[PDB]
Amino acid sequence: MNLTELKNTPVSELITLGENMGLENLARMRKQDIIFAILKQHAKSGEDIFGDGVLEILQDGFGFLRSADSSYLAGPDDIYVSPSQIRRFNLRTGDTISGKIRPPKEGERYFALLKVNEVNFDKPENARNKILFENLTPLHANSRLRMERGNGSTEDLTARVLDLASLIGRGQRGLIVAPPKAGKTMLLQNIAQSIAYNHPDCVLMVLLID
Amino acid sequence: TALQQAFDTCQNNKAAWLQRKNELAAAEQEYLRLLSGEGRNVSRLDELRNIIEVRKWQVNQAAGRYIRSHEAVQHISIRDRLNDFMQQHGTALAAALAPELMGYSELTAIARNCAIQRATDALREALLSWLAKGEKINYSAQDSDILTTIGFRPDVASVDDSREKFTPAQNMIFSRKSAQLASRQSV
Ligand SMILES: Nc1ncnc2c1ncn2[C@@H]1O[C@H](COP(=O)(O)OP(=O)(O)OP(O)(O)=S)[C@@H](O)[C@H]1O
Ligand SMILES: [Mg+2]
């Protein structure tokens, strides 16, 4: 089946479903190994298996496919991608790929990508004739990105202050300088909640380091 | 023969101002309709407000241009009617106003403009006394149709929408915004 749903499921029911349909011991190893084993056995059963994620090209033009749920770990469940598919479907680095996948055979140990059904959420042939990001000409921020929820929340005050403090728009390059113990993380919480509420169409990404 | 071109310019400026009014009204009613809706398209509302501001500035500019064209048409029509009235009654006006008029021919600029202002004052009391009867003043022979189509005064909307004035900073920012909107419409 589609590995995304089972990957998003917590470990307890993953273990119980591994054990209830013909597995020996799954409790005492990592989640990635559990997913790899259950995918291998389900593929040996014979049903179709689906995968999706983000493509990474190594230094030799050789492709892995990672999952955003695992925060792009180099887990055993990463999808094999040969350079032939990269050159034939003509992808980039960081594309979003979804399609049927192939169980590994002798000589390899990651699941291979059989066929692609969607690249960056549109038709695969439509991806080839796409314009590069660097070729795009930049501009200034035009569309206002309001940071007011409008629900009259008690904490919404903070977000309201942001609207009174600085103007944020699409394409804006923003910096928040602050010493430790100043509320940066929950200010980011408020910003993310405001983006999710007021603007549910724009893609929201929250990146954390160390 | 420039009066016909001036009339055409006034007509097309009027048409531009009217059409500006039409898309301003359309954007206004669409924005009120979206406000009446329960959608959470806040960014849509912000860009709609930006559109309202840009269209209001465009309407003000078009109204100002139309007013300027109307004044130019009135001035040129008055000048032409003045010329073809004076080419008829210049000798009579000169006979009735003679002293300062042959004073102009050899006096210095100070005496020249003193006589000019004396004559204009005298005709000022002349007109204010003549207008006592106040009969129905008719237009001229061939410019009557032009003056009727242009009208005695411009529309009340085209003058009240121009009460607000913008400093050159606002003019520059709204010109940039209008150019950006034109680029958006083109794409
Ligand atoms: N809007 C707020 N309402 C209530 N408490 C707040 C608010 N903003 C900050 N605080 C308090 O600020 C303290 C620190 O909050 P944090 O967001 O963890 O600070 P920080 O900027 O993230 O610094 P770090 O993450 O510890 S390095 C906590 O005690 C919070 O309760
Ligand atoms: Mg924090």
Short mmCIF file of C-alpha atoms and ligand atoms in Angstrom, two decimals:
data_model
loop_
_atom_site.label_atom_id
_atom_site.label_comp_id
_atom_site.label_asym_id
_atom_site.label_seq_id
_atom_site.Cartn_x
_atom_site.Cartn_y
_atom_site.Cartn_z
CA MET A 1 0.00 0.00 0.00
CA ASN A 2 0.94 3.68 0.16
CA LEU A 3 3.81 3.89 2.64
CA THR A 4 2.96 7.49 3.58
CA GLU A 5 -0.06 6.57 5.72
CA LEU A 6 1.78 3.80 7.58
CA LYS A 7 4.77 6.11 8.06
CA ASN A 8 2.53 8.78 9.61
CA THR A 9 0.99 6.23 11.99
CA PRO A 10 2.61 5.96 15.44
CA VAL A 11 4.72 2.92 16.21
CA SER A 12 2.30 0.95 18.40
CA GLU A 13 -0.30 0.07 15.78
CA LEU A 14 2.49 -0.37 13.23
CA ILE A 15 3.94 -3.09 15.47
CA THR A 16 0.56 -4.71 16.11
CA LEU A 17 -0.26 -4.81 12.39
CA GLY A 18 3.19 -6.20 11.65
CA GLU A 19 2.69 -8.97 14.19
CA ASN A 20 -0.94 -9.78 13.37
CA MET A 21 -0.22 -10.76 9.74
CA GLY A 22 2.90 -12.92 9.80
CA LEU A 23 5.95 -11.36 11.44
CA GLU A 24 8.31 -12.65 14.11
CA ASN A 25 9.53 -9.72 16.25
CA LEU A 26 9.23 -5.99 15.55
CA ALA A 27 9.25 -4.28 18.96
CA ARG A 28 13.02 -4.03 19.46
CA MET A 29 14.27 -2.17 16.43
CA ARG A 30 13.86 1.26 14.86
CA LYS A 31 10.77 2.57 13.08
CA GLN A 32 12.62 2.75 9.76
CA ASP A 33 13.55 -0.94 9.95
CA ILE A 34 9.97 -1.82 10.90
CA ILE A 35 8.65 0.05 7.86
CA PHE A 36 11.25 -1.55 5.60
CA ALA A 37 10.40 -5.06 6.81
CA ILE A 38 6.63 -4.61 6.49
CA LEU A 39 7.03 -3.08 3.02
CA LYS A 40 9.26 -5.98 1.95
CA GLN A 41 6.79 -8.60 3.17
CA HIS A 42 3.79 -6.79 1.64
CA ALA A 43 5.64 -6.55 -1.68
CA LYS A 44 6.52 -10.25 -1.49
CA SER A 45 2.78 -10.83 -1.05
CA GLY A 46 2.28 -9.32 -4.51
CA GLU A 47 0.01 -6.27 -4.14
CA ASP A 48 0.84 -2.86 -5.59
CA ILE A 49 2.97 -0.59 -3.40
CA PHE A 50 2.96 3.22 -3.59
CA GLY A 51 5.53 5.78 -2.48
CA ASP A 52 6.19 9.50 -2.48
CA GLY A 53 8.67 12.05 -1.21
CA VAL A 54 11.50 14.37 -2.22
CA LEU A 55 14.32 13.43 -4.60
CA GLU A 56 18.00 13.83 -3.71
CA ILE A 57 20.77 13.48 -6.30
CA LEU A 58 24.13 12.33 -4.96
CA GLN A 59 27.55 13.45 -6.18
CA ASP A 60 27.50 10.77 -8.91
CA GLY A 61 24.05 11.55 -10.33
CA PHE A 62 22.53 8.75 -8.24
CA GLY A 63 19.11 9.20 -6.70
CA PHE A 64 17.54 8.63 -3.31
CA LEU A 65 14.00 9.58 -2.35
CA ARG A 66 13.43 10.79 1.21
CA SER A 67 10.28 11.43 3.23
CA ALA A 68 9.40 14.68 4.99
CA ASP A 69 7.76 12.83 7.89
CA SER A 70 11.13 11.38 8.94
CA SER A 71 12.75 14.83 8.44
CA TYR A 72 14.79 13.43 5.52
CA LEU A 73 16.76 10.80 7.42
CA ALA A 74 18.93 8.40 5.41
CA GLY A 75 16.71 5.52 6.46
CA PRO A 76 16.51 2.10 4.83
CA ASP A 77 13.05 2.96 3.47
CA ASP A 78 14.39 5.68 1.16
CA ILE A 79 13.42 4.96 -2.43
CA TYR A 80 16.04 3.84 -4.95
CA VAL A 81 16.26 6.03 -8.06
CA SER A 82 18.65 5.17 -10.90
CA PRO A 83 20.26 7.93 -13.01
CA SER A 84 18.43 6.55 -16.06
CA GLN A 85 15.07 7.60 -14.63
CA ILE A 86 16.56 10.97 -13.66
CA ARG A 87 17.73 11.61 -17.22
CA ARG A 88 14.58 10.21 -18.84
CA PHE A 89 11.90 11.98 -16.79
CA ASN A 90 14.35 14.91 -16.44
CA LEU A 91 13.90 15.94 -12.81
CA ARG A 92 15.59 18.47 -10.51
CA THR A 93 16.87 18.31 -6.93
CA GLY A 94 14.07 18.74 -4.40
CA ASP A 95 11.16 17.70 -6.61
CA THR A 96 8.10 16.01 -5.12
CA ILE A 97 7.61 12.56 -6.67
CA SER A 98 4.73 10.12 -6.16
CA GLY A 99 4.23 6.79 -7.89
CA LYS A 100 4.31 3.02 -7.77
CA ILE A 101 7.52 1.54 -6.38
CA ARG A 102 9.32 -1.78 -6.79
CA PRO A 103 10.54 -4.20 -4.12
CA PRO A 104 14.32 -4.57 -4.03
CA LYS A 105 15.93 -7.71 -5.42
CA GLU A 106 19.36 -9.30 -5.07
CA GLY A 107 22.18 -6.79 -5.47
CA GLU A 108 20.31 -3.80 -4.02
CA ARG A 109 18.67 -2.90 -0.72
CA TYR A 110 16.37 0.09 -1.31
CA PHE A 111 12.95 -0.04 -2.94
CA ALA A 112 13.14 1.07 -6.57
CA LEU A 113 10.78 3.50 -8.29
CA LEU A 114 8.76 1.69 -10.97
CA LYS A 115 6.80 4.58 -12.49
CA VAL A 116 5.97 8.18 -11.61
CA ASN A 117 2.37 9.34 -11.27
CA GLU A 118 2.85 12.96 -10.14
CA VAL A 119 5.80 15.37 -10.01
CA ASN A 120 5.40 18.58 -7.96
CA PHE A 121 1.63 17.96 -7.86
CA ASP A 122 1.04 18.09 -11.63
CA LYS A 123 1.37 15.85 -14.66
CA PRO A 124 4.90 14.44 -15.16
CA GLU A 125 5.12 15.62 -18.77
CA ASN A 126 4.15 19.14 -17.67
CA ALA A 127 7.22 19.28 -15.40
CA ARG A 128 9.79 19.05 -18.20
CA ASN A 129 8.75 22.31 -19.90
CA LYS A 130 9.09 24.35 -16.70
CA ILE A 131 11.01 27.60 -16.23
CA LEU A 132 13.97 27.73 -13.86
CA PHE A 133 13.89 29.53 -10.53
CA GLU A 134 17.12 31.46 -11.17
CA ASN A 135 15.89 32.66 -14.57
CA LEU A 136 12.97 34.37 -12.82
CA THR A 137 13.29 38.09 -12.34
CA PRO A 138 12.82 39.22 -8.73
CA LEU A 139 10.65 42.10 -7.59
CA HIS A 140 9.59 43.73 -4.33
CA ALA A 141 6.86 42.48 -2.03
CA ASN A 142 3.45 43.49 -3.41
CA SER A 143 0.65 41.38 -1.92
CA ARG A 144 0.13 42.13 1.77
CA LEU A 145 0.32 39.10 4.06
CA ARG A 146 -1.88 40.10 7.00
CA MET A 147 -0.98 38.64 10.40
CA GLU A 148 -4.36 39.22 12.11
CA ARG A 149 -6.54 36.18 12.74
CA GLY A 150 -9.64 38.29 13.38
CA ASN A 151 -11.19 35.79 15.81
CA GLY A 152 -10.60 38.12 18.78
CA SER A 153 -8.41 35.68 20.70
CA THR A 154 -6.76 36.70 23.96
CA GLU A 155 -3.30 35.84 22.62
CA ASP A 156 -4.16 37.31 19.20
CA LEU A 157 -2.99 40.59 20.75
CA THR A 158 0.58 39.50 20.02
CA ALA A 159 -0.20 38.86 16.36
CA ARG A 160 -2.03 42.19 16.21
CA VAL A 161 1.10 43.94 17.50
CA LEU A 162 3.00 42.39 14.60
CA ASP A 163 0.62 44.05 12.15
CA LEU A 164 1.29 47.34 13.92
CA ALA A 165 5.06 46.74 14.03
CA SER A 166 6.23 45.46 10.63
CA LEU A 167 4.69 44.77 7.23
CA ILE A 168 4.99 41.22 5.89
CA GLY A 169 4.16 40.35 2.29
CA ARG A 170 4.66 37.60 -0.23
CA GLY A 171 8.31 37.34 -1.24
CA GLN A 172 9.47 39.27 1.83
CA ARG A 173 12.96 38.66 3.24
CA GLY A 174 12.53 38.89 7.01
CA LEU A 175 14.84 38.78 10.02
CA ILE A 176 13.90 38.46 13.70
CA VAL A 177 16.87 39.35 15.90
CA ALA A 178 16.40 38.57 19.58
CA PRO A 179 18.52 37.47 22.55
CA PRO A 180 17.69 34.20 24.32
CA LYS A 181 14.59 33.98 26.53
CA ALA A 182 12.66 36.54 24.48
CA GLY A 183 9.79 34.56 22.95
CA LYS A 184 11.14 33.83 19.46
CA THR A 185 9.75 30.30 19.21
CA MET A 186 6.20 31.17 20.22
CA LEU A 187 6.33 34.28 18.05
CA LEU A 188 7.03 31.85 15.21
CA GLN A 189 4.12 29.77 16.54
CA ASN A 190 1.83 32.79 16.26
CA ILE A 191 3.09 33.60 12.76
CA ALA A 192 2.53 30.00 11.63
CA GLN A 193 -0.98 29.92 13.09
CA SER A 194 -1.81 33.23 11.40
CA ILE A 195 -0.53 31.92 8.06
CA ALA A 196 -2.51 28.70 8.43
CA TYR A 197 -5.70 30.59 9.34
CA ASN A 198 -5.72 33.68 7.12
CA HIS A 199 -3.89 32.21 4.10
CA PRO A 200 -4.63 28.47 3.80
CA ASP A 201 -3.52 28.41 0.14
CA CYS A 202 0.16 29.31 0.49
CA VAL A 203 2.55 26.49 1.36
CA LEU A 204 3.90 26.85 4.91
CA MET A 205 7.27 25.40 5.92
CA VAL A 206 8.84 25.60 9.39
CA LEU A 207 12.54 24.69 9.47
CA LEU A 208 14.42 24.13 12.72
CA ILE A 209 18.17 23.72 13.20
CA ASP A 210 19.88 22.07 16.21
CA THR B 1 -9.83 74.94 -36.99
CA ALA B 2 -8.37 73.56 -33.75
CA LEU B 3 -11.77 73.79 -32.02
CA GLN B 4 -13.00 70.54 -33.59
CA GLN B 5 -9.91 68.68 -32.38
CA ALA B 6 -10.34 70.25 -28.93
CA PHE B 7 -13.98 69.10 -28.91
CA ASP B 8 -12.92 65.57 -29.87
CA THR B 9 -10.31 65.57 -27.10
CA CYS B 10 -12.93 66.72 -24.59
CA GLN B 11 -15.28 63.97 -25.77
CA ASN B 12 -12.69 61.21 -25.46
CA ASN B 13 -11.55 62.50 -22.06
CA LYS B 14 -15.19 62.41 -20.94
CA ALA B 15 -15.48 58.84 -22.23
CA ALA B 16 -12.30 57.86 -20.37
CA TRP B 17 -13.57 59.41 -17.13
CA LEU B 18 -16.93 57.65 -17.52
CA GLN B 19 -15.33 54.26 -18.14
CA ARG B 20 -13.00 54.81 -15.16
CA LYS B 21 -16.13 55.42 -13.09
CA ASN B 22 -17.60 52.17 -14.41
CA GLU B 23 -14.75 49.88 -13.40
CA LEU B 24 -14.39 51.74 -10.10
CA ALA B 25 -18.06 51.01 -9.37
CA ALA B 26 -17.64 47.39 -10.49
CA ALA B 27 -14.65 46.86 -8.20
CA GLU B 28 -16.47 48.58 -5.34
CA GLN B 29 -19.58 46.40 -5.64
CA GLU B 30 -17.48 43.24 -6.01
CA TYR B 31 -15.53 44.16 -2.87
CA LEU B 32 -18.77 44.73 -0.94
CA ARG B 33 -20.06 41.38 -2.23
CA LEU B 34 -16.91 39.64 -1.00
CA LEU B 35 -17.22 41.39 2.37
CA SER B 36 -20.80 40.13 2.62
CA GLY B 37 -19.43 36.63 2.06
CA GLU B 38 -18.07 34.51 4.89
CA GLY B 39 -14.83 33.50 3.17
CA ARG B 40 -11.46 33.97 4.86
CA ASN B 41 -9.79 35.45 1.75
CA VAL B 42 -8.08 38.23 3.68
CA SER B 43 -5.37 38.66 1.03
CA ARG B 44 -8.14 39.02 -1.55
CA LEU B 45 -9.65 41.82 0.54
CA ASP B 46 -6.28 43.58 0.87
CA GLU B 47 -5.61 43.47 -2.86
CA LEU B 48 -9.20 44.61 -3.47
CA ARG B 49 -8.55 47.64 -1.25
CA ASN B 50 -5.38 48.30 -3.24
CA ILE B 51 -7.44 48.10 -6.45
CA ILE B 52 -9.97 50.55 -5.00
CA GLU B 53 -7.22 53.03 -4.15
CA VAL B 54 -5.55 52.72 -7.56
CA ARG B 55 -8.85 53.11 -9.42
CA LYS B 56 -9.79 56.12 -7.28
CA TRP B 57 -6.48 57.77 -8.18
CA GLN B 58 -7.04 56.94 -11.85
CA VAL B 59 -10.55 58.43 -11.71
CA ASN B 60 -9.21 61.60 -10.10
CA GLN B 61 -6.52 61.92 -12.78
CA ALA B 62 -9.03 61.35 -15.60
CA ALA B 63 -11.44 63.89 -14.11
CA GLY B 64 -8.65 66.45 -13.84
CA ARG B 65 -7.60 65.87 -17.44
CA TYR B 66 -11.20 66.18 -18.62
CA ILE B 67 -11.62 69.44 -16.68
CA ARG B 68 -8.44 70.81 -18.25
CA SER B 69 -9.65 69.83 -21.72
CA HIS B 70 -13.05 71.42 -21.04
CA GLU B 71 -11.38 74.66 -19.96
CA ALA B 72 -9.17 74.60 -23.06
CA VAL B 73 -12.19 74.10 -25.33
CA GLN B 74 -14.06 76.95 -23.65
CA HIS B 75 -11.02 79.23 -23.91
CA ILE B 76 -10.39 78.51 -27.59
CA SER B 77 -14.08 78.91 -28.48
CA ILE B 78 -14.21 82.22 -26.59
CA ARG B 79 -11.06 83.37 -28.37
CA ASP B 80 -12.39 82.48 -31.83
CA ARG B 81 -15.75 84.15 -31.22
CA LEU B 82 -13.87 87.16 -29.85
CA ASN B 83 -11.77 87.32 -33.02
CA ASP B 84 -14.65 87.15 -35.46
CA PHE B 85 -16.63 89.69 -33.41
CA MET B 86 -13.71 92.14 -33.19
CA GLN B 87 -12.94 91.82 -36.90
CA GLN B 88 -16.47 93.22 -37.34
CA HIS B 89 -16.72 95.88 -34.61
CA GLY B 90 -13.09 96.90 -34.06
CA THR B 91 -13.56 100.35 -35.57
CA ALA B 92 -16.66 100.93 -33.43
CA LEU B 93 -14.92 99.78 -30.24
CA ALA B 94 -11.94 101.98 -31.08
CA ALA B 95 -14.18 105.00 -31.69
CA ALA B 96 -15.99 104.42 -28.39
CA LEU B 97 -12.73 103.83 -26.44
CA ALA B 98 -10.35 106.08 -28.36
CA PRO B 99 -8.25 108.10 -25.80
CA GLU B 100 -6.34 105.26 -24.17
CA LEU B 101 -6.18 103.42 -27.50
CA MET B 102 -4.11 106.00 -29.28
CA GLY B 103 -2.35 106.53 -25.97
CA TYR B 104 -1.09 102.96 -26.35
CA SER B 105 0.51 103.69 -29.73
CA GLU B 106 3.27 105.97 -28.39
CA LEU B 107 3.32 105.80 -24.57
CA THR B 108 5.70 103.85 -22.36
CA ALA B 109 4.89 100.45 -20.88
CA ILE B 110 3.84 102.00 -17.56
CA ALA B 111 1.34 104.27 -19.31
CA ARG B 112 0.48 101.36 -21.62
CA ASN B 113 -0.65 99.04 -18.84
CA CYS B 114 -2.21 101.90 -16.86
CA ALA B 115 -4.41 102.62 -19.88
CA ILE B 116 -5.02 98.88 -20.28
CA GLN B 117 -6.28 98.54 -16.71
CA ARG B 118 -8.34 101.74 -16.96
CA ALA B 119 -10.02 100.40 -20.11
CA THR B 120 -10.68 96.99 -18.58
CA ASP B 121 -12.18 98.59 -15.47
CA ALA B 122 -14.40 100.83 -17.61
CA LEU B 123 -15.68 97.86 -19.58
CA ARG B 124 -16.16 96.05 -16.25
CA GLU B 125 -18.71 98.62 -15.12
CA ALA B 126 -20.05 98.58 -18.70
CA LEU B 127 -20.80 94.84 -18.54
CA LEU B 128 -22.14 94.91 -14.99
CA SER B 129 -24.52 97.70 -16.00
CA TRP B 130 -25.54 95.98 -19.25
CA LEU B 131 -26.36 92.67 -17.54
CA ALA B 132 -29.23 94.38 -15.69
CA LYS B 133 -31.73 93.32 -18.36
CA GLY B 134 -30.26 89.80 -18.42
CA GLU B 135 -31.98 88.45 -21.53
CA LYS B 136 -31.47 84.84 -22.62
CA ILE B 137 -27.93 84.80 -24.01
CA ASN B 138 -27.63 82.55 -27.06
CA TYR B 139 -24.55 80.84 -28.47
CA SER B 140 -22.71 81.79 -31.65
CA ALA B 141 -23.39 80.82 -35.26
CA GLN B 142 -21.24 77.75 -35.94
CA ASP B 143 -19.92 77.02 -32.42
CA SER B 144 -23.40 76.68 -30.88
CA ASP B 145 -23.43 72.90 -31.36
CA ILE B 146 -19.92 72.55 -29.92
CA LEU B 147 -20.79 74.67 -26.88
CA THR B 148 -24.02 72.71 -26.37
CA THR B 149 -22.31 69.31 -26.54
CA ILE B 150 -19.49 70.48 -24.27
CA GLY B 151 -22.00 72.27 -22.04
CA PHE B 152 -21.89 75.42 -19.94
CA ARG B 153 -20.15 73.62 -17.06
CA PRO B 154 -18.77 70.09 -16.60
CA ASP B 155 -20.63 67.42 -14.69
CA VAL B 156 -20.95 67.74 -10.93
CA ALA B 157 -19.39 64.30 -10.41
CA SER B 158 -16.29 65.19 -12.44
CA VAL B 159 -15.68 68.22 -10.20
CA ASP B 160 -16.54 66.78 -6.78
CA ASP B 161 -14.36 63.70 -7.32
CA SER B 162 -11.37 66.07 -7.65
CA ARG B 163 -11.67 67.76 -4.24
CA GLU B 164 -8.73 65.73 -2.92
CA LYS B 165 -5.24 66.63 -4.12
CA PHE B 166 -2.07 64.53 -4.12
CA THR B 167 1.45 65.78 -3.56
CA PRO B 168 4.05 64.60 -6.11
CA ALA B 169 5.04 61.77 -3.74
CA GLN B 170 1.51 60.37 -3.84
CA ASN B 171 1.39 60.96 -7.59
CA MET B 172 4.61 58.98 -8.06
CA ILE B 173 3.55 56.11 -5.79
CA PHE B 174 0.13 55.81 -7.43
CA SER B 175 1.69 55.99 -10.90
CA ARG B 176 3.97 53.10 -9.92
CA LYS B 177 1.01 51.17 -8.52
CA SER B 178 -1.03 51.82 -11.68
CA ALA B 179 1.86 50.62 -13.85
CA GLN B 180 2.10 47.48 -11.72
CA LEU B 181 -1.65 46.92 -12.10
CA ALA B 182 -1.37 47.41 -15.87
CA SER B 183 1.40 44.79 -15.95
CA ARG B 184 -0.79 42.47 -13.87
CA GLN B 185 -3.72 42.95 -16.27
CA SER B 186 -1.50 42.36 -19.31
CA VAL B 187 -0.26 39.03 -17.93
N1 LIG C 1 2.82 36.07 24.22
C1 LIG C 1 3.25 35.47 25.33
N2 LIG C 1 2.35 35.11 26.27
C2 LIG C 1 2.78 34.51 27.38
N3 LIG C 1 4.03 34.20 27.74
C3 LIG C 1 4.90 34.57 26.79
C4 LIG C 1 4.61 35.20 25.59
N4 LIG C 1 5.77 35.43 24.87
C5 LIG C 1 6.72 34.94 25.63
N5 LIG C 1 6.27 34.41 26.81
C6 LIG C 1 7.07 33.80 27.86
O1 LIG C 1 8.43 33.91 27.50
C7 LIG C 1 9.18 32.83 28.11
C8 LIG C 1 10.15 32.25 27.10
O2 LIG C 1 9.45 31.92 25.89
P1 LIG C 1 10.24 31.30 24.66
O3 LIG C 1 9.45 31.41 23.36
O4 LIG C 1 10.61 29.91 25.02
O5 LIG C 1 11.53 32.21 24.51
P2 LIG C 1 12.54 31.95 23.32
O6 LIG C 1 12.68 33.28 22.57
O7 LIG C 1 12.05 30.85 22.46
O8 LIG C 1 13.98 31.61 23.88
P3 LIG C 1 14.49 30.14 23.86
O9 LIG C 1 13.65 29.33 22.83
O10 LIG C 1 14.31 29.52 25.27
S1 LIG C 1 16.37 30.10 23.36
C9 LIG C 1 8.15 31.84 28.67
O11 LIG C 1 8.11 31.90 30.09
C10 LIG C 1 6.82 32.31 28.05
O12 LIG C 1 5.73 32.09 28.94
MG MG C 2 11.83 28.89 21.85
#
